C-alpha cells in the first residue's frame, strides 16, 4: 500500500520581482522531482536514482506542465489579493498538495487536491472527486468558476488515471528503494533531571518508511503519563529518526520498557535501561 | 507525473 504526492508552493515578493514557485514530488516518504523558479536550470529535475532513467520527452512534458502551473499560481496570487482587498505590499502564499493512493493489489484507493492561502484551507476537492469545499467567501467565488469550468472532472481524470498508472511505474522502476523496509536500530539513554526523577529516552534510527509507533510500558502496563514523542526527522540519506521519553522515579528505571513497531520488524522490539 | 495545469485560475 503506497502513495504519490506533489507539493507546490508559490510566494509573492512585491518589488523583489515575480513570485517564487517551488514544486516537489514524493512516492511514499521519498522525494523524486523538484522545480524552482529562481534556479539557473529552468527544468523539472531528478532527486532519486530511479527517475534519472526517464527520457527527455518525460522531462520536457513535466517541465512545461509545471511552468504552465507556476504561471496560473502567479495570476492566482493577484486574483486572491483582489478577493481579500489586500495591498500589494505584503508577501502572500498559495500552497497546493495533491496526489493519489493505491492498495497492495495496485488499484486506486483515494485522491486528494487541497489549496490554501497564507497557511489556511482555501478550497479542497472532496473524496467524491466530484465537488469542492470553500473555507471562506473568496474560495466560494473560485468554487463557482471551478464548478462551471468542470475543474473537478479534470482532477478526477488525473487522480484515477495518470496518477496511478505512473505511481505504479515509479514503484516498479524504484522497487529496490521504494519497496525496501529498513528496520529501526534502537538504543536507550538516561538523564538524571533531579535527585528524585530521571529521563529515559528510547531511540530509533535509520528506519524507512517514516511510519513508526513508539510506546512505553510500566510493570507490563500501557504508560502515556509523563511521556514525550519528538516529530519524526530525516537522516539526510533517505531514512528517519525519532525518540520517545518518559520521566521516571530514580531507582525505578527497571520497570519501564520501550516498545517499537515498524513495518520491517516481524516481531515488535523491546528495550530496557542497562547500566 | 504532474497534473496538467488547470484551464481556469481561481
Amino acid at each position, epitope marked *: 500500500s503506497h502513495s504519490m504526492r506533489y507539493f507546490y508552493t508559490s510566494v509573492s515578493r512585491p518589488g523583489r520581482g515575480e513570485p517564487r514557485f517551488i514544486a516537489v514530488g514524493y512516492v511514499d516518504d521519498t522525494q523524486f522531482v523538484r522545480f524552482d523558479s529562481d534556479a539557473a536550470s529552468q527544468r523539472m529535475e531528478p532527486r532519486a536514482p530511479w527517475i534519472e532513467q526517464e527520457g527527455p520527452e518525460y522531462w520536457d512534458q513535466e517541465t*512545461r*506542465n509545471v*511552468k504552465a502551473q507556476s*504561471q496560473t499560481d502567479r495570476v492566482d496570487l493577484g486574483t486572491l489579493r483582489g478577493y481579500y482587498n489586500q495591498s500589494e505590499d505584503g508577501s502572500h502564499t498559495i500552497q497546493i498538495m495533491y496526489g493519489c493512493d493505491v492498495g497492495p493489489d495496485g488499484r486506486f484507493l483515494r485522491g486528494y487536491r487541497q489549496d490554501a492561502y497564507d497557511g489556511k484551507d482555501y478550497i479542497a476537492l472532496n473524496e467524491d472527486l466530484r465537488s469542492w469545499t470553500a473555507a471562506d467567501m473568496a474560495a466560494q467565488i473560485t468554487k463557482r468558476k471551478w464548478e462551471a469550468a468542470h475543474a473537478a*472532472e*479534470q482532477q478526477r481524470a488525473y487522480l484515477e488515471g495518470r496518477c496511478v498508472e505512473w505511481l505504479r511505474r515509479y514503484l516498479e522502476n524504484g522497487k529496490e528503494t521504494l519497496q525496501r523496509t529498513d528496520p529501526p536500530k534502537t538504543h536507550m539513554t538516561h538523564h538524571p533531571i533531579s535527585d528524585h526523577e530521571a529521563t529515559l529516552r528510547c531511540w530509533a534510527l535509520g528506519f524507512y518508511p517514516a511510519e513508526i509507533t513508539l510506546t512505553w510500558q510500566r510493570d507490563g502496563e500501557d504508560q502515556t503519563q509523563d511521556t514525550e514523542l519528538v516529530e519524526t526527522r530525516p537522516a539526510g540519506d533517505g531514512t528517519f529518526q525519532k525518540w520517545a521519553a518518559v520521566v521516571v522515579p530514580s531507582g525505578e528505571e527497571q520497570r519501564y520498557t520501550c516498545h517499537v513497531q515498524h513495518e520491517g520488524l516481524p516481531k515488535p522490539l523491546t528495550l530496557r535501561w542497562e547500566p | 507525473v504532474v497534473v*496538467g495545469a488547470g*484551464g*481556469v485560475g481561481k
Partner: T-cell receptor, first 117, second 117 residues
Framework: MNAGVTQTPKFRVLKTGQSMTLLCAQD?????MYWYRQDPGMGLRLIHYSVGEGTTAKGEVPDGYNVSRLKKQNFLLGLESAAPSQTSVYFCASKVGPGQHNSPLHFGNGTRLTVTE | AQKVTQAQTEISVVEKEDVTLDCVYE???????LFWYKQPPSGELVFLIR??????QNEISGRYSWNFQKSTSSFNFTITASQVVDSAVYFCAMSVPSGDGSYQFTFGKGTKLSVIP
C-alpha cells in the same frame, strides 16, 4: 460588451519595397497577442507573437516582418520592405493568458494587402 | 510533433441534411485542448467549441454535435439539418503548453463546406 480584436487597415496596396504598419488593438486585457497570414492551401501561419508587454517572439514565418508590443493593448506588424510574396490576408489574434490556459484565440476581421511591382 | 489534419479540402451536401467534418490530431503531450472555428464568406474567425484532454466523448450544442475519440486521435464535427448559412470554411485546431508554459496553437488547413439549396 467588448469590441474584441480591431485591425487597421482593412485594405492596402503597396509598391514592392514600400513599407507599412498594420495596427491591432484588443480591449479585453489579454496577455498574449498574435499576427497570422492566411493563404490558399497554407491555411493559418503565425508570423510573430507576444506573451506580454515589451516582449515578442518569432513564429513560423517571421522573415520579412518586424513587430512591437510596446503596450499590452496593441501589437504592431511592420513590413519594412514589401515583397509580392507578402500579398495576403493578415489576421491579428489575442488570448487571455495563464489565468485561462483553455482560452481560445480571438481573431480580428483581417487586413487584405496586395503588394505590386 | 504537433500536427492537426483535416484531410477533406472540400465537401458539399444539399440542405436539411447531416454532414460530418473529419479532424485528426497528432501530439505526445497529455494536457491538450482541441478547438473548432468557423470562417464564413465574410472572413472572420468564430470560436465554436473546445474539448479538453480529460473530456467526455460527446458534446451537443444546438444543431452542432462533436465526437472526441482519444484512442484514435479524431475530433469529428457533425451538423444536423444543414442550412446553406452553414456553408463556410471550418478549422480544427489544438493547444499544448509551449516552452515558457504559455498555451500555443496548431491549425488544420480547413474543410470548405458548401450547403446548396
Amino acid at each position: 460588451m467588448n469590441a474584441g480584436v480591431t485591425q487597421t487597415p482593412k485594405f492596402r496596396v503597396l509598391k514592392t519595397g514600400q513599407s507599412m504598419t498594420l495596427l491591432c488593438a484588443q480591449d479585453m486585457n489579454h496577455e498574449y497577442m498574435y499576427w497570422y497570414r492566411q493563404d490558399p492551401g497554407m491555411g493559418l501561419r503565425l508570423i510573430h507573437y507576444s506573451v506580454g508587454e515589451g516582449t515578442t517572439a518569432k513564429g513560423e514565418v517571421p522573415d520579412g516582418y518586424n513587430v512591437s508590443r510596446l503596450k499590452k493593448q496593441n501589437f504592431l506588424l511592420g513590413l519594412e520592405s514589401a515583397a509580392p510574396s507578402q500579398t495576403s490576408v493578415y489576421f491579428c489574434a489575442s488570448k487571455v493568458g495563464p489565468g485561462q490556459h483553455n482560452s481560445p484565440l480571438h481573431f480580428g476581421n483581417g487586413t487584405r494587402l496586395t503588394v505590386t511591382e | 510533433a504537433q500536427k492537426v489534419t483535416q484531410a477533406q479540402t472540400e465537401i458539399s451536401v444539399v440542405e436539411k441534411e447531416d454532414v460530418t467534418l473529419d479532424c485528426v490530431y497528432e501530439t505526445r503531450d497529455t494536457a491538450y485542448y482541441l478547438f473548432w472555428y468557423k470562417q464564413p464568406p465574410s472572413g472572420e474567425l468564430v470560436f465554436l467549441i473546445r474539448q479538453p484532454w480529460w473530456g467526455e466523448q460527446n458534446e451537443i450544442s444546438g444543431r452542432y454535435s462533436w465526437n472526441f475519440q482519444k484512442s484514435t486521435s479524431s475530433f469529428n464535427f457533425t451538423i444536423t439539418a444543414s442550412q446553406v448559412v452553414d456553408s463556410a470554411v471550418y478549422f480544427c485546431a489544438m493547444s499544448v503548453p509551449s516552452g515558457d508554459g504559455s498555451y500555443q496553437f496548431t491549425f488544420g488547413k480547413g474543410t470548405k463546406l458548401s450547403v446548396i439549396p
